[PDB]
Design a protein around this ligand. Structure first.
Ligand SMILES: CCOCCOC(=O)N[C@@H](Cc1ccccc1)[C@@H](O)C[C@]1(Cc2ccccc2)NC=C([C@H]2c3ccccc3[C@H]3NC(=O)O[C@H]32)C1=O
Lengths: 99, 99
């Protein structure tokens, strides 16, 4: 699909059997989701944003569907303003910018 | 052009008579650049994201060239970690997400 940018590029994702709204964010290297429960062990990660560097929990090899496309990769969990789908998963679904 | 997301989507922009490197960010409503001088009047604004909020100066009707594509729009100037081209200008150059 082709997504224009006149509005926020919000899509529905599926993770842990539940649906959530997320933002396709090309300016984000990683994917960060609002507080939720994920399986397995996690490692610490510091991510930098417009307002500063914060701490999140890093989970690897997590199943996540983005707009119907299945992906398996790293998902960070922390106090993010919105669910963000970053380049690590955008590349898995074959996303590119065009103009 | 078709820009890959294997790396950060960085491009050259021309604004105020000078060349700079900026990040194409679909997850940002606005465009914000590191401290620089711009012509015309401005109003204060607070923008927030990962890490919190930062105070910026809002300049309207500013001419900019992104990857050789001319456009006009609002440009915020402040202590952003990186130059960011947001949706307000990405739409003007016909930028879309595809997958
Ligand atoms: C994020 C996980 O991987 C690592 C984190 O990557 C980042 O934090 N990347 C930065 C970009 C970046 C910052 C520092 C260093 C490199 C890149 C942004 O792309 C992330 C984000 C997420 C977001 C989206 C909607 C609302 C809140 C937060 N998307 C947009 C905003 C803000 C933003 C940015 C510019 C202008 C106005 C605004 C605001 N108004 C608005 O619409 O969005 C807000 C972000 O922080």
């Amino acid at each position: 699909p082709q997504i224009t940018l006149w509005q926020r590029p919000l899509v529905t994702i599926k993770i842990g059997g539940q649906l959530k709204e997320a933002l396709l964010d090309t300016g984000a290297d990683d994917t960060v989701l609002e507080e939720m429960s994920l399986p397995g062990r996690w490692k610490p990660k510091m991510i930098g944003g417009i307002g500063g560097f914060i701490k999140v929990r890093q989970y690897d090899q997590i199943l996540i569907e983005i707009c119907g496309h299945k992906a398996i990769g790293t998902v960070l969990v922390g106090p993010t303003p919105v669910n963000i789908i970053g380049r690590n998963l955008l590349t898995q679904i074959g996303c590119t910018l065009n103009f």
